C-alpha cells in the first residue's frame, strides 16, 4: 500500500528494541511494507553477543527504530 518513510535511514546504524526488552543495533539494509527490516552486522545490546552476518526482523515485534547517526 504505502511504503514506510525509511529511505533516509539506509546504510546507517540504528538501534531498535525488539519486543519490550531486547534491543538490537545494526546497519539497516532494506525494508518491506509490513516494516520488516533486514539489518546486517547485528549486536544484541545488553558482554553483548553478535547475532550474525544477515538477520531479518519481523515488523510485528518492532516498537521504535531510533537511529544512532547523523541522519
Amino acid at each position: 500500500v504505502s511504503t514506510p518513510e525509511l529511505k533516509k535511514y539506509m546504510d546507517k546504524k540504528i538501534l531498535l528494541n525488539i519486543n519490550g526488552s531486547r534491543k538490537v543495533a545494526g546497519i539497516l539494509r532494506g525494508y518491506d511494507i509490513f516494516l520488516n527490516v533486514v539489518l546486517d552486522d547485528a549486536m544484541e545490546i545488553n558482554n553483548n553477543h553478535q547475532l550474525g552476518l544477515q538477520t531479518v526482523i519481523r515488523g510485528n515485534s518492532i516498537i521504535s527504530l531510533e537511529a544512532l547517526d547523523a541522519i
Binding site: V1, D32, I33, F34
Partner: peptide, 16 residues
C-alpha cells in the same frame, strides 16, 4: 489493492 498481503503475493510469486 486490499491488504498488503496481495502486494506481497505479487512480489513473492515473481520471486519464486
Amino acid at each position: 489493492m486490499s491488504t498488503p498481503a496481495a502486494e506481497q503475493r505479487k512480489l513473492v510469486e515473481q520471486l519464486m
